[PDB]
Structure formats: C-alpha cells, structure tokens
Design a protein around this ligand. Structure first.
Ligand code: HEM
Ligand code: HEM
Ligand SMILES: [O]
Ligand SMILES: [O]
Lengths: 362, 363
C-alpha cells in the first residue's frame, strides 16, 4: 500500500505500474476567469500532494472549527496511500478559454469518426480530466470526490467512469490481468522500465512543436461496450481466432508461452493482435492503460459490461488514430462497440513543491 | 483469510466477515417449468461450490473441445477465492410461480411506502437475488456473470449493483469502515461471534411459522442516494449532530471511544443513532451488511454517490420496518433519498455436497 511519488519531470499514473482500480472524471469549466482557474490548479495540486501521500487535504477531515465544513470529506481515513496517482489532462475545448487558443497542441488532434461508433455525447469529451488510479477503489473515489468539491463553482463533473479491474500492464515481469472476455490484456505494451520506448512513443518532446507540452503526453479514452451475450455463445476456437492468442496461456497462436513474440502470419488476417501490432502500423506503438467496467444492466435482462480503454502516446496522430483505423476489419468488432470518447493533453510533471498542474501552459 | 466455507446450516455471507466488495444481482424468472427451475438451482449450487473455492465452473475456462463455448468465461483465472460468498434469496413474486403461493413466509413482508421514497421500479424488486461478496471485485463480478450465463433461458438479470467499498461490520475486533459521508458505519451491529443474538434477531426458527425457512434469514435491500454536495457544505458540527457520534473517533456524544455504548438522551432527538437504536424501537435489531456505490453522475455536474443498504433479520415485520418507520423525522433525511428497494427470503444453508439452494422449499 505504498505511495507513488507525485513529483517528476512526468506526471505519475502513466509509466507507473498499473494500479488495480480506476476512478476517471471528465470536468467542464464553468468560470471564464483565468486567475480563478489558475488558483484552482494550485489548490488542486496541493490537495493531490496530500491525497497521493494518503493524507487528508488541507487541515483534515475533523478536529477543526465546529462551524466550518471540514477540508476533507473523510471517507479515506484509516486507509493507505494505495499507490494512488492523480493525472490531469486538458481537453481541446479548454483552449477556447483563458486566451489559450494559440497554445492548443497540434498533437492534440480531434479523432475522426470511426465505423460503428455510437458515441454518447454526454459521456464524451470534457474540458479536462483527472485520472485516479489506486489499488483501493475508495482511495480513488475519495480523491475525485474531494477535487470536485474543491472545484465547486469553477468546474463541474461532466461524466465519470469507475473501473473495477485493470486490463493493462506496464510491468511485463508481473502477472498480466484479464479483461471481461477472459483474455490476458497488456502482454505487449510499454514497460515503465523501457525509458527509451517511452521517450520514443509516449512523451512529447520540445522539438515536436509545443514547448509547454515537453514531458507531457496525449491521452485517448474510449468507453467500449462488450456484447457479452454474443461472446459467451462463441466457441473457444472462435474466441482464440478473434485475438490471435490462445485463451489459457495467452501465447500467440502456434507458440507455447504468453511472452513469446507474435508470428503474425500464423494468425487470421482479421485477428486483433495482427491488426494492432506495431509492425502492421508503421511502427506506431501505444501505452495502453485501461480498465474493465460494469454499469448496471441494459434493461434487457443482461449485465452491461465493457472496457474503458486508455491509450497514452507522443502524438494522437501517430498513435491511436492509425492503429484504430487499422482495426476497421478487426474480428473483435463483432463483439464490441465504442460508445464514448475523449482526448486530452496531459501536461508535464509537477517538478517540485512550488510547481503546479499546468504551470507550463499558464 | 483466503476462503469461506460454502456449506453450513446457514448460507455464508450473512454472519461471516464482511468482505471488501459487492456485486448484487436481482433476477427475474422466465420459465414456468418447476422442474427446470429446480435444475437451475442444482446447476447454480454446483457452480457456487467451484466459484467460492476459486475454481472455474463446469469443465473450466479453456481446454475443452475447440468448437464448444467454454464452461467458464475466464476472467477469474489467476485470481484467488477472495473470501467469496454467494447468498441466494427468494422474492415474494417467486412464490406466484411453480404453485408456491402458500409457501411464501409470513416473515417475508412487503415493505410499506415510506415518507420520502423515490423508488425506481426498474431497480426494485426481483424474483430472486444473488449477493456476491469478495475482497476482489473481479471475483464477485465473475461469479455473477457466470451465474447469469448459466441461467440464461430460465432467468434474466433485472438489476445489478456494484459496491466498491463496505459500510458494515460483523467483526467488531477489526477496524470499522467508513461510508461516503465520512463516518464509521457498522459499530453497533451484530457480530458473527454473537451466536445468541443471531438466533434471536437474524435466523428464522421452525416455530416462527415457515419450517422450510428454518436457518435462513430475511433480507431488505435499499439503494440510498446521498446528496453529497449539500452534505459537504455543512459544518462539521452539523454533520456530527446528524448522527449523534463525532466524525473522527465515532464515539457517541459525550464519550471518548467508538465502542462506548451510546447515551441517547445526549443526542439531538432527530439524530440518526438515537432514532435507529433498538431501545427506540422495541428492541428491534438489524444485521447491517451494506456497501458504498458510485454510478456515474447526476444529470447536473455532480457525482451520484450513495449507500447500498442491506439488512438481515429474523422477521422483516420486526426488523427493518419498525426501524425505518422511526427514521421518518431523521435529520439524515435532508441528505439522503431511498431510490431502490427489494425484499427476499434467504433460505437455510447448503448442508453438504449433495444439497442444493432451495431444497427445503422445492423438496
Ligand atoms: C474491448 C476492446 C478491446 C479488447 C477486449 C482488447 C483486447 C486485447 C488483447 C487480448 C490483446 C492481446 C494481449 C496484449 O498484447 O495486450 C490486445 C493487444 C493489443 N491491443 Fe487491444 N483490445 C481492445 C481494444 C483495443 C483498441 C481500441 C486498441 C487501439 C486502438 C487496441 C490496441 C492493442 C494493441 C496495440 C495491442 C498490442 C499488440 C501487439 O503489439 O502485440 N486494443 N488487446
Ligand atoms: C445512507 C444511509 C445511511 C447512512 C449514511 C447511515 C449511517 C449510520 C451511521 C454513521 C451509524 C453509526 C455507526 C454504526 O453504529 O453503525 C449508523 C447506525 C445505525 N443505522 Fe444507519 N445509516 C443509513 C441508513 C440506515 C437505514 C436505512 C437504517 C434502517 C432502516 C439504518 C439503521 C441503523 C442502525 C440500526 C444503526 C445502529 C443503532 C445502534 O447504535 O444500535 N441506517 N448509521
Ligand atoms: O488492447
Ligand atoms: O446504518
């Protein structure tokens, strides 16, 4: 239940080992006062320092003046830091405010429309996001809930997604988690230890064209419904054919071990791994960091379940966009549907205790 | 602990230690065939035996005939039993089927309308329920998902609730968990160790008037929204006055320790503990076993937080109903709203590997 350092050239929550649980919130800004928004970012940064150390925000959750509401709502008392990370991003829509228009990064591209999209606009977009990842779901919910409260009057919660289990890995030496289709998910990703690959594929560089984004990254979120009724009636072979790996061990078809390298020509041409592989996409590589969800029932007698997909990359135009375009013929398409979407510019890290979220932009 | 025994005179998941996470599903029955429903109960019991031992259902999640769908959907492979318990209950509407109307227990009382109810009927009721509790939410979700799959064609999922963190205790010797209002919740409950209180307040007895229910219990579920923005703008003193305990230690007003017994007169007369206490309700006592939830946002820019309240008792008429009736004036009502409700008759335990869920009811 240890604590992930909050400061760094890069924000935590990206290369960091993937924590077991997720609370993701998109916010919309309701103030048009740049000074007030800057003040919010500083307050938020200070609260995140405490929250990620497992401490209450401000003066605490109790023991203050009886006539004052407590600084912290208290539901994380007695819990551990739980490897909490808090990662902020800025949406394209934010750059219509605070005189920021000319600072929107080129690499923060709006996505094209994709075949089979059914995007719920109310569960899409957002002026900004906060990604809360922790091994304890209540540590994550508490962070989001208290950030929202601190921002009362200046921002609102547009949409929020709980992820009950991870479907990603930045630690290939560790057990790979499974998604709700029963397959290991995260085998061939990017590790936090592969500093070279993160520099190449994840972190924006000064020369890419947006100096304030140096050391940040670009994030794509996709809420993906899974047609579990359809999947659960499919034979084992069909499921294995869909991905290009076997279900039990997770090894590429033909091979014996999960982490044996794919031999792509042995997979079906519409196999998910074959279409998504960097070698099929001009080298394009993603840091996938998604989680599973279930939100009630569909009103039709079935659980509503899916995968809240997250992908970090140096440039949306060289990462998610080409790979997703190449999944147009993916056999997995028969079993999923994209029903929410948003993109964000994730600024560089909080350098020290004097720095604050977004300082390079503001 | 890593696992909880599935067999017993009682179903596990009631008096046993409260696990960290919840997946609760209410099902509606679609078949009119009693034998086929009995077949489902047997299949389900077999699956629960495996699931609660951390094993896949049926022949497993892979390694079968490549042309056959796997028996288990696989998302619990490599996970642990995680103290998983699976607890089944039977709703009033179940007894309108399979020629059972005269076997519905009197202690399975319908709830009355309560002041302030705003019940979503689609997230209320149900012919039956399965309570899945485990420390790992994926283990719980996997159990519900495979039970629903196994049952398809004979049952559908009416509504389902994820509980991301507990707000109850049956083990006072460990730390008491906090709810989304920031208060310890579970301090004065019924412990697994209190055999006599469980017999008095939780387990149905043969003499109560429904012999097949001997050893079972009766379950009330309430989905309670929390008006969290309003709560967080109230002063610490107002919050503590709402409950009658202080927020930090959870001690009754005027006392120093969480588990000091309350002095109720020192609380505001509309304080939640004072109104809910057995001494204010003719001795009526509950075994609370609920969890917190968040399900997205309201329409309006604010999280949709709340408490998925669960209460086990020997007779709904002498448990939840009187206590909830007394919360009509609760100061807590300013900050909550009941938006979902169901009741269920939870049968006695699966005695051995030959037994099955509901066997005392169906024969
Ligand atoms: C519900 C939706 C999805 C499911 C269930 C899923 C599942 C999987 C599985 C089982 C693997 C193989 C193990 C692994 O390498 O992680 C995989 C690999 C991968 N997936 Fe997905 N995926 C989904 C959506 C996506 C999307 C939307 C993208 C990008 C637009 C994507 C990109 C990738 C990539 C790049 C790999 C690695 C392939 C390699 O380099 O070997 N996936 N996914
Ligand atoms: C969001 C809804 C609720 C919240 C936040 C809440 C919170 C609390 C808290 C903080 C306590 C004191 C700690 C403890 O002893 O557990 C408590 C006690 C209690 N609550 Fe609730 N409660 C809620 C709903 C209910 C409902 C609906 C009932 C019954 C109908 C109920 C019955 C009780 C009882 C019986 C006690 C213990 C009384 C005693 O000390 O003997 N609660 N509750
Ligand atoms: O993926
Ligand atoms: O409670």
């Amino acid at each position: 239940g240890s604590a992930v350092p909050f400061h760094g050239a890069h924000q935590a929550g990206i290369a960091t080992p993937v924590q077991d649980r997720l609370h993701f919130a998109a916010f919309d800004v309701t103030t048009e006062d740049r000074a007030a928004f800057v003040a919010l970012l500083k307050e938020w940064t200070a609260a995140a320092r405490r929250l990620t150390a497992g401490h209450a925000v401000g003066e605490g959750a109790y023991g203050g003046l009886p006539e004052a509401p407590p600084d912290d709502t208290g539901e994380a008392l007695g819990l551990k830091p739980s490897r909490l990370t808090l990662t902020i991003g800025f949406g394209p829509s934010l750059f219509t405010r605070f005189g920021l228009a000319d600072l929107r990064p080129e690499a923060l591209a709006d996505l094209p429309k994709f075949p089979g999209d059914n995007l719920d606009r109310a569960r899409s977009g957002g002026d900004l996001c906060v990604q809360a990842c922790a091994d304890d779901p209540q540590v994550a919910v508490h962070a989001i809930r208290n950030l929202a409260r601190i921002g009362f009057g200046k921002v609102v919660v547009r949409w929020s997604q709980l992820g009950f289990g991870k479907t990603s890995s930045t630690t290939p030496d560790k057990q790979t988690p499974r998604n709700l289709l029963g397959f290991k998910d995260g085998t061939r990703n990017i590790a936090g230890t592969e500093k070279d690959r993160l520099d190449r594929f994840v972190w924006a560089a000064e020369k890419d064209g947006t100096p304030w984004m140096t050391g940040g990254s670009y994030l794509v979120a996709r809420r993906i419904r899974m047609h579990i009724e359809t999947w659960d009636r499919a034979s084992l072979q069909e499921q294995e054919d869909v991905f290009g790996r076997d279900k039990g061990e997770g090894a590429p078809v033909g091979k014996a071990k999960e982490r044996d390298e794919p031999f792509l020509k042995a997979m079906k041409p519409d196999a998910h791994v074959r279409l998504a592989h960097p070698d099929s996409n001009g080298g394009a590589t993603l840091l996938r960091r998604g989680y599973s969800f279930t939100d009630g029932t569909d009103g039709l007698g079935r659980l509503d379940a899916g995968l809240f997909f997250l992908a970090y990359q140096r440039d949306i135009r060289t990462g998610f966009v080409p790979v997703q375009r190449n999944l147009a013929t993916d056999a997995l398409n028969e079993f999923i549907q994209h029903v929410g979407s948003a993109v964000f510019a994730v600024p560089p890290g909080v350098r020290d205790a004097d720095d604050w979220w977004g300082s390079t932009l503001f």
